[PDB]
């Protein structure tokens, strides 16, 4: 039993809610919140800018030190950093940017990172400025993640369509 509330059950391990991941993180303080990051951990907009703004830029400060030491992530890769005031940890996961020509097949690799964590609060990867079809992203998630994932979708009309489609 966990403290995630009001999520619609999609599969055995995937639950979904029309909500802001920031507000869900502040309320639940999960062990792991997933960030939809880029390889440089530059958290400007989307989920990344939203999470970072909620940390008063501490996420960005920590991220800049991470990159200075380790260099950029791989597309499809991830790193574990602090969750600051939002969660214990933040798993920064890089989905492919299909508006940049990056390989959509890398979306499955990106979701594989979730399997290293028993429970996660996450957004759909590669949506938004990265341009992937949300229904596709949701389907890859269901077919790849085996741990317990709670999805927060912050677009009402998109959420409504996602919960009326097949997976
Ligand atoms: C920006 C933001 C802030 N807080 C959030 N919580 C969840 N998702 C978010 N953006 C991605 C999406 O869920 C999926 C793609 C769609 C185009 C927009 C909604 C955000």
Swiss-Prot record:
Compartments where found: Host endoplasmic reticulum membrane
Q: Which residues form the Macro domain?
A: 1-167
Reactions performed catalytically: Thiol-dependent hydrolysis of ester, thioester, amide, peptide and isopeptide bonds formed by the C-terminal Gly of ubiquitin (a 76-residue protein attached to proteins as an intracellular targeting signal)
Q: How does it sit in the membrane?
A: Multi-pass membrane protein
Regulation of its function: Inhibited in vitro by GRL-0617.
Q: What role is this protein assigned? A: Responsible for the cleavages located at the N-terminus of the replicase polyprotein. Participates together with nsp4 in the assembly of virally-induced cytoplasmic double-membrane vesicles necessary for viral replication. Antagonizes innate immune induction of type I interferon by blocking the phosphorylation, dimerization and subsequent nuclear translocation of host IRF3. Also prevents host NF-kappa-B signaling. In addition, PL-PRO possesses a deubiquitinating/deISGylating activity and processes both 'Lys-48'- and 'Lys-63'-linked polyubiquitin chains from cellular substrates.
Quaternary structure note: May form homohexamers. Interacts with N protein.
Q: What is this protein called?
A: Papain-like protease nsp3
**Which source organism does the UniProt entry give?**
Severe acute respiratory syndrome coronavirus 2 (2019-nCoV)
Source gene?
rep
């Amino acid at each position: 039993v966990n403290s995630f509330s009001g999520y619609l059950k999609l599969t055995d391990n995937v639950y979904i809610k029309n909500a802001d991941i920031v507000e869900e993180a502040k309320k639940v303080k999960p062990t792991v919140v997933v960030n939809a990051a880029n390889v440089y951990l530059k958290h400007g907009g989307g989920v990344a800018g939203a999470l970072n703004k909620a940390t008063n830029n501490a996420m960005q400060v920590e991220s800049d030190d991470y990159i200075a030491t380790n260099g950029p992530l791989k597309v499809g890769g991830s790193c574990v950093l602090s969750g600051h005031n939002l969660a214990k940890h933040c798993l920064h996961v890089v989905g492919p940017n299909v508006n940049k020509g990056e390989d959509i097949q890398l979306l499955k690799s990106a979701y594989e990172n979730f399997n290293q964590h028993e429970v996660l609060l996450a957004p759909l990867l590669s949506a938004g400025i990265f341009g992937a079809d949300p229904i596709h992203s949701l389907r890859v998630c269901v077919d790849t993640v085996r741990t317990n994932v709670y999805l927060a979708v912050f677009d009402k009309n998109l959420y409504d369509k996602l919960v009326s489609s097949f997976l």
